[PDB]
Amino acid sequence: MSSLRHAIQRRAHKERAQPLERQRLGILEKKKDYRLRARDYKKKQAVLKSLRQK
Amino acid sequence: FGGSSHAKGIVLEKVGVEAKQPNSAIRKCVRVQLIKNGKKVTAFVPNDGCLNFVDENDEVLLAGFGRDIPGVRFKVVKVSGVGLLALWKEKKEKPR
Amino acid sequence: FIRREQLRIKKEKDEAYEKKFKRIIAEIQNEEGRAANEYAREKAAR
Amino acid sequence: GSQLKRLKASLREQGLIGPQKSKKQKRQNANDQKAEALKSIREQFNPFQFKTNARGPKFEVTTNVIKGRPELSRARSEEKRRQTILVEMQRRNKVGGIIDRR
Amino acid sequence: AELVAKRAWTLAGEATAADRPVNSLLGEDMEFDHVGKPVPVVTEEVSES
Amino acid sequence: ADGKMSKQELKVYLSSRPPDPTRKPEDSAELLA
Amino acid sequence: EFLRFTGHRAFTQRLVLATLYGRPIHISKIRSSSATNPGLAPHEISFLRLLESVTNGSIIDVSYSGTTITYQPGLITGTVPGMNASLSSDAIEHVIPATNTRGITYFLIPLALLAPFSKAHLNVRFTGPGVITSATHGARDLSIDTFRTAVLPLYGLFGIPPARIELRVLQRSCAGPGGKGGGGIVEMRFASQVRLPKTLHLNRRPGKVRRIRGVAYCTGVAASHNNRMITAARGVLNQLVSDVHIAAQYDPAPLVAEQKKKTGIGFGLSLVAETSAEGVIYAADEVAPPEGGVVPEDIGEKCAYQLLDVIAQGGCVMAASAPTVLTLMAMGSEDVGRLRLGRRVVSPELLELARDLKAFGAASWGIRDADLIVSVKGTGVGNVGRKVA
Amino acid sequence: KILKTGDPLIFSLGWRRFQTLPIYSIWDNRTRNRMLKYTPEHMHCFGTFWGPLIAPNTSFCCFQSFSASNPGFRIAATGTVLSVDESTEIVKKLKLVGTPWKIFKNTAFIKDMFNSSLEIAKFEGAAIRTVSGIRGQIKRALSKPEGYFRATFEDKILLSDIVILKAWYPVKPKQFYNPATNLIGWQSMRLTGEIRRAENIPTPQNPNSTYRKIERPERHFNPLRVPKNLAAELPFKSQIVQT
Amino acid sequence: TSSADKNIRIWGLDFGDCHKALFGHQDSILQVAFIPHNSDGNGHYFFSASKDRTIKY
RNA sequence: CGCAAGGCUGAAAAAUUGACGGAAGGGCACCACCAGGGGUGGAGCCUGCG
């Protein structure tokens, strides 16, 4: 359950960053930023597919 | 069971030790054999990490389970004279 | 060759695991529910 | 000619497909090989079992055309992999063996 | 000395192409997942069937 | 010959399992329904 | 290299006890007398291959002459899917070559008494040209039917339950051309791995032999052969017992490789007398000579005479299954178990087993009168590796 | 203190006291017996060492150093013997890490991962993955830059992304065995911290591995860019009006 | 063994296994005969004569 | 749980409607004729197939 877990069970797992030898390329895209990118592209392609049908 | 509130048992075999998902109820359930009557019943360890304290052939106290396998009636309360939640909270060591 | 062998082994292993644990969970639920319904019948008669 | 027509002509030459002979024609046949030729027929009229070039030889030299069997070669190579690579994949971590010096 | 020395490239978790020697993957025996079905090669039993 | 045993004795002996040693329209209502 | 044995007598018993106790052995001077074919026999080297296959970490070393081997045993894993096979339910293949004269029970008896002490299951599948599922003239090996319903109930007595033993033949075969050859494939699946066998007690008299059931098998001959054999065996045993019942089994022929040939043409019979008391059964077998062509009624009378011999002779267990029950009694827990042997039952193979157990480190045996009660102290080893969940 | 794998440990197990160096491994989700690098706090992990064989379900204690000058609580680990074997199956994750070189819509060329087309031909068809979560498959070795390859991904990856391949390399424990013959005398193998403090070598620390705080700007995307021919062909009720 | 079902059988005479049943005549085969001498190296050859006006070696 | 689950045995027809053709006459085809065009095949590079 939720009372059968310690605080070390609850402890957050940190996110790694972009390596410092590669920081000029921008931020390291993880699942959240990838979800934002994919949502924007699927939305724009949905509008373009409806415009091509019309 | 019987006429008592808690029964004792021998842990015959931790069934579902090779189950995949961690907090599965098949992972948590343990086949024990009651001492007084002799029958093999199944009981829930309360937690998957708490399963590791239950070893084979250990005297186990078990009570009712009052609220994924609906119908397994018992839960393991004490193992070898020490309370299982105390073992899980790391209050006591298990005398073997 | 290693692709075909590993995919065959993965299919056979996953099918065997699914079959075995469906049998185990069904037998455990069957026995425990049978004893629970027998105890509820013997308790409701009191 | 067609493959159908040449197959029919070769089987009429080998006497496997011809008209229903009378008992007198069978008497003539018992009065007066074919499996060895049927093997060549079943090899020649199924030409995709083996790899052939179409052009023939580039420079003719005279000195005294199946160039490879891909089906048989693939089955042979898969048997070799069954005997070595799958066996090592089974015995990934297997220590010790019989040391046969004889 | 082995415990204090540097880890091998197989024991470091992230081995990029600068760490190891040139064709050092061919000497290792690792397992990994593949993607998708392979195509079935036509064998003589398949053509016979 | 009387060696033909039975299906039960064939099931215990000639199977793959070795034999363990520790065994020894009345009424109108129903017709209308 | 440490422990030292000589001779080729009870070779499989020595290797199996070495595997079970973990004591490294060195067996020297296999065939010193034979100048024509010195060294190891083909069935012996194939048993070495099978032992290496089912164990793990065992190192076997055969010398240049072939007359000395040494053997440092490992653990009996069985068919684990990481080391021995690819899947846990997969049968480990074992091929034994065409120049094999001994029966397959020569491989099955040590494997069946080494199998309850394994880690995972055992799923061995004996294929190949030289797999004879019959009795041999040979060293008078048991058949598969004799082996199954005569000695696996003894594991049932020890508490290794025969609900999970699966010994099944897929083809059956006799010897064929001379003693060499075979062809019939088998597979044995031990799924019942125990920690410690129970200390059993065979002490009460197994007096009333209640019934006789048996198997008469024919591979490659006419199917009237087993009917004539049943009439012969019933003509002998109807003086004594009202219920003798013998199943008839017939297989066409097994094919081996040279282009395949049909080999293993023969026929045989195997009687099992069941005593009403407990798990006490007396077995006897007889097979046709692989070149002779003798009368099936002669074979039926011969096996009935051997069965009446074993019924007259045996205390509780016959001498064919006496080494297996005695070495499992030695593997049991640190108590005494009491077997009731006949005085005629005691054999040089049984005596050699006693010498081997005393050399290995098990306790001696206590022999008193009642036929004699032999009492064995267990050593309490059991199986070494088992995943205690 | 936590207790690391590889570092030695004095096991009291049976009548034997013996110092050996174990390998700590979790049983991942009952699949592969993955090798950990430390023991988990407040959790039973599996260990694996090379010592004498004991019949299982035998409890044991486990110390680090038999010294009286330990300021607190000399006993380190407890537990029970699970099973015994030869040639264990412990497995550690090895990630081959690469970088995209040219990025098309799906097929990206990936550079700093392999060294030759022989290695790529071995790892053909392998499940490659982006850090972001995009799956993909190694398709074909690339000819002209030796060591690059073509991998068709799920969607378009970015040049900032890191492309990993998660292989499982087996790890065998070492076969070391000290007896703790205390009445005679014995050499005690030290721990890695004592070795580093004695022979003066700093602990290896990677600055790319140490966790940092990541400054994420709010992701704003470009507006929709409709092509000219489509924007001139679509009808009057849905024609785009831009002053 | 020459029968009236238009074939001959070859048995091995140890265990009496049929070596090969071989259908060889168009009518009921009357008689069969071995050549007795293996002095010429051919003693396992035999003739068979049948109602369809044929002998077969 | 019951049936299936007992070996004259031992690997490699149909037809009053069917089997195969021949001769004559049609139709079509850049796997045919006719008129042209273009490859490949010569030297080098290399995917792939054997």
Nucleotides of strand J under 7 angstroms from a protein beta carbon: 2-12, 18-21, 40-42, 49-50
Mutation site for H-interface testing, chosen from G20, G75, G196 by largest number of H Cβ within 10 Å: G75
Tell me, in Å, the resolution of the deposited structure.
7.0
Residues of chain G positioned with their CB less than 8 A from the CB of D92: 82-83
- Helices G322-331 and G105-114 sit at what angle, rounded to 10 degrees? 20
**CB-based burial, G138-172: b 16+ in 10 Å, e otherwise:** beebbbbbbbbbbbbbbbbbbbbebeebbbebebb
Q: Quick one: tokens of G172?
A: 């059956």
**Rounded to an integer, what distance in angstroms lies between the CA atom of residue G60 and that of residue I34?**
56
**Rounded to an integer, what distance in angstroms lies between the CA atom of residue G91 and that of residue G122?**
8
In order of A36, G81, G92, G124, G381, the CA distances from G86 in angstroms are 43, 5, 9, 14, 30
Q: Quick one: tokens of G153?
A: 């109930």
Å between H144 CA and J45 C1'? 13
**Rounded to an integer, what distance in angstroms lies between the CA atom of residue B29 and that of residue B49?**
13
Method: cryo-EM
Within 10 angstroms of residue B43's Cβ, the number of other Cβ atoms is 25
CB G182 within 8 A of CB G139: no
In order of H103, H113, H159, H164, the CA distances from H107 in angstroms are 7, 16, 13, 15
How is residue G11 annotated by DSSP? H
User: Chain centroid to CA G315: how far?
Assistant: 20
CB G218 within 8 A of CB G226: yes
Residue D34 CB burial class (10 angstroms; 0-12, 13-18, ≥19):
exposed
Interface of E with H in 17-46 (CB under 8 A): 17-18, 20-26, 28-36, 38
Is the CB of D89 less than 8 angstroms away from the CB of C2?
Answer: yes
CB G236 within 8 A of CB G297: no
With tokens 């005085």, the residue in question is G343
Q: Quick one: tokens of H92?
A: 């550690």
Nearest to G71 by CA among G20, G110, G18: G18
Q: Quick one: tokens of G119?
A: 């880690």
With tokens 């494939």, the residue in question is G185
How is residue E27 annotated by DSSP? T
**Residue D49 contacts E, CB cutoff 8 Å:** yes
**Rounded to an integer, what distance in angstroms lies between the CA atom of residue H36 and that of residue H1?**
16
Query: Are chains H and F in touch, 3+ Cβ pairs below 8 Å?
Result: no
**Taken in order G125, G126, G129, G132, is the CA torsion positive or negative?**
negative
CB G133 within 8 A of CB G144: yes
Within 8 A by CB and 6+ apart from C14, the residues are none
**Rounded to an integer, what distance in angstroms lies between the CA atom of residue G162 and that of residue G173?**
25
With tokens 């009052």, the residue in question is B66
CB B21 within 8 A of CB C18: no
Residue G301 CB burial class (10 angstroms; 0-12, 13-18, ≥19):
middle
What's the start-to-end Cα distance of chain G, in Å? 35
**Residue D85 contacts C, CB cutoff 8 Å:** yes
Is the CB of H78 less than 8 angstroms away from the CB of B93?
Answer: yes
User: Chain centroid to CA H132: how far?
Assistant: 17
CA distance D70 to chain C (A): 17
**Rounded to an integer, what distance in angstroms lies between the CA atom of residue G375 and that of residue G366?**
5
In order of A43, A46, H231, the CA distances from H224 in angstroms are 10, 11, 12
**Rounded to an integer, what distance in angstroms lies between the CA atom of residue G308 and that of residue H152?**
78
Nearest to D94 by CA among H68, H86, H216, B47: H86
- Strands H16-20 and H178-179, how do they pair? antiparallel
What is residue C32's three-state secondary structure? helix
Within 8 A by CB and 6+ apart from G127, the residues are G93, G94, G95, G185
Q: Quick one: tokens of B60?
A: 């186990």
Interface of I with G in 7-46 (CB under 8 A): 12-17
Nearest to G132 by CA among G93, G97, G167, G173: G173
Mutation site for G-interface testing, chosen from H27, H30, H46, H86 by largest number of G Cβ within 10 Å: H86
**Rounded to an integer, what distance in angstroms lies between the CA atom of residue D14 and that of residue D35?**
9
Nucleotide with minimal C1' distance from the CA of D55 is J41
- Helices G348-360 and G11-21 sit at what angle, rounded to 10 degrees? 30
Question: What amino acid is encoded at H202 in this protein?
Answer: P
